[PDB]
Amino acid sequence: PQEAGGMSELQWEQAQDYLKRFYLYDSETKNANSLEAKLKEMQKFFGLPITGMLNSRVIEIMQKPRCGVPDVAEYSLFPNSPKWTSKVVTYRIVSYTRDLPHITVDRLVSKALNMWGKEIPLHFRKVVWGTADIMIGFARGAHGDSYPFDGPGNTLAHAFAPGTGLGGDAHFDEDERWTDGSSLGINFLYAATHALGHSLGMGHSSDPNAVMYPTYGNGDPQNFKLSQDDIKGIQKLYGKRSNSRKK
Ligand SMILES: [Ca+2]
Ligand SMILES: [Ca+2]
Ligand SMILES: [Zn+2]
Ligand SMILES: [Zn+2]
């Protein structure tokens, strides 16, 4: 909490490790000098300009929630594919949270997922009989998977990469707050575009107006939608397109 930067080694480790979990679990790189190199990468990935340092904006974000998905791969059980390679993608809800009835959760995922679908030539299909590729469920890290519950705050939602039928699923930290009309904690619409975006193998982006922006913050937009730099990125791989925007 601000002083994390100049805290004792034990508390300080939490800061260094908070970035580390958001990337991967590699005990080799754990080091006090190596710290400085890896931070360089955090700053480009995040976008923030201040670099080689941490305490003010860098920490402000570690403590602030964002996402629970790693951003890299190394010694783990996952396939190698940048995006979905299936002919069609599908999605179904497993369970629902008391904050929102089942229909509401469901229509939010479609209202976000579809929004991605329109920005790409992939073909998406609605579910009415049987299981689907992407399962959307509420659960805690102790449901039977890696990534722990870590309580509310830090770590917002883990999700999986488009891998096989089982992999590709999306999840929501049930501990976290979830709503839409109340507009109090995390809007489902907003996180859904992010969580579902990770089910497409999209990586984060640095623009401050990005949809996967890892620096959660910004004001309260009117309707809100896919961003410019985020769209061109996915298009460059599914086809060919370019663009530029800042602020
Ligand atoms: Ca959490
Ligand atoms: Ca899946
Ligand atoms: Zn993310
Ligand atoms: Zn899980």
Short mmCIF file of all heavy atoms in Angstrom, two decimals, residues 84 132-135 163-169, ligand 2:
data_model
loop_
_atom_site.label_atom_id
_atom_site.label_comp_id
_atom_site.label_asym_id
_atom_site.label_seq_id
_atom_site.Cartn_x
_atom_site.Cartn_y
_atom_site.Cartn_z
N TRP A 84 -8.17 -19.42 -31.07
CA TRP A 84 -8.99 -20.57 -31.47
C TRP A 84 -8.60 -21.02 -32.87
O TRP A 84 -8.43 -20.16 -33.72
CB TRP A 84 -10.51 -20.24 -31.52
CG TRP A 84 -11.12 -20.29 -30.15
CD1 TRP A 84 -11.59 -19.27 -29.41
CD2 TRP A 84 -11.34 -21.55 -29.35
NE1 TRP A 84 -12.04 -19.73 -28.27
CE2 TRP A 84 -11.90 -21.07 -28.19
CE3 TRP A 84 -11.10 -22.90 -29.57
CZ2 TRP A 84 -12.23 -21.92 -27.13
CZ3 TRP A 84 -11.43 -23.77 -28.52
CH2 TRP A 84 -11.97 -23.29 -27.32
N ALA A 132 -20.83 -27.04 -24.19
CA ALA A 132 -20.21 -26.08 -25.10
C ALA A 132 -18.71 -26.08 -24.94
O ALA A 132 -18.23 -26.74 -24.04
CB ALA A 132 -20.77 -24.69 -24.72
N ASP A 133 -17.98 -25.33 -25.79
CA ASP A 133 -16.53 -25.27 -25.64
C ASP A 133 -16.23 -24.44 -24.41
O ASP A 133 -15.58 -24.94 -23.51
CB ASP A 133 -15.80 -24.66 -26.87
CG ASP A 133 -16.14 -25.41 -28.13
OD1 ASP A 133 -15.81 -26.63 -28.20
OD2 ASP A 133 -16.74 -24.81 -29.06
N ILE A 134 -16.70 -23.17 -24.37
CA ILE A 134 -16.32 -22.30 -23.26
C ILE A 134 -17.35 -22.52 -22.16
O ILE A 134 -18.52 -22.33 -22.43
CB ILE A 134 -16.27 -20.79 -23.65
CG1 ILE A 134 -15.39 -20.56 -24.92
CG2 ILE A 134 -15.72 -19.94 -22.46
CD1 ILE A 134 -15.42 -19.08 -25.41
N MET A 135 -16.96 -22.90 -20.93
CA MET A 135 -17.93 -22.97 -19.83
C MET A 135 -17.74 -21.71 -19.00
O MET A 135 -16.59 -21.36 -18.79
CB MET A 135 -17.69 -24.27 -19.02
CG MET A 135 -17.77 -25.53 -19.92
SD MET A 135 -19.33 -25.66 -20.87
CE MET A 135 -20.59 -25.75 -19.56
N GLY A 163 -7.78 -23.97 -25.82
CA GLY A 163 -6.96 -25.17 -25.93
C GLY A 163 -7.84 -26.39 -25.82
O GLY A 163 -8.33 -26.64 -24.73
N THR A 164 -8.07 -27.17 -26.90
CA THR A 164 -8.90 -28.37 -26.77
C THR A 164 -10.30 -27.95 -26.38
O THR A 164 -10.55 -26.76 -26.24
CB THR A 164 -8.24 -29.36 -25.76
OG1 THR A 164 -6.90 -28.91 -25.45
CG2 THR A 164 -8.14 -30.81 -26.32
N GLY A 165 -11.26 -28.89 -26.21
CA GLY A 165 -12.59 -28.50 -25.76
C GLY A 165 -12.55 -28.09 -24.31
O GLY A 165 -13.09 -27.05 -23.97
N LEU A 166 -11.92 -28.92 -23.44
CA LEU A 166 -11.90 -28.61 -22.01
C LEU A 166 -11.25 -27.26 -21.84
O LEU A 166 -11.89 -26.38 -21.29
CB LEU A 166 -11.19 -29.74 -21.20
CG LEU A 166 -11.25 -29.59 -19.65
CD1 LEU A 166 -10.91 -30.95 -18.97
CD2 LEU A 166 -10.28 -28.50 -19.10
N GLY A 167 -9.99 -27.06 -22.30
CA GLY A 167 -9.37 -25.75 -22.13
C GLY A 167 -10.10 -24.73 -22.97
O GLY A 167 -10.89 -25.12 -23.83
N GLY A 168 -9.85 -23.43 -22.73
CA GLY A 168 -10.68 -22.37 -23.30
C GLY A 168 -11.73 -21.87 -22.33
O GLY A 168 -12.27 -20.81 -22.62
N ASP A 169 -12.05 -22.55 -21.21
CA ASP A 169 -13.14 -22.08 -20.35
C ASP A 169 -12.85 -20.74 -19.70
O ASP A 169 -11.69 -20.35 -19.66
CB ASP A 169 -13.51 -23.09 -19.22
CG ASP A 169 -13.81 -24.46 -19.77
OD1 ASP A 169 -14.53 -24.54 -20.80
OD2 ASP A 169 -13.35 -25.46 -19.16
CA CA B 2 -13.27 -24.93 -22.82
#
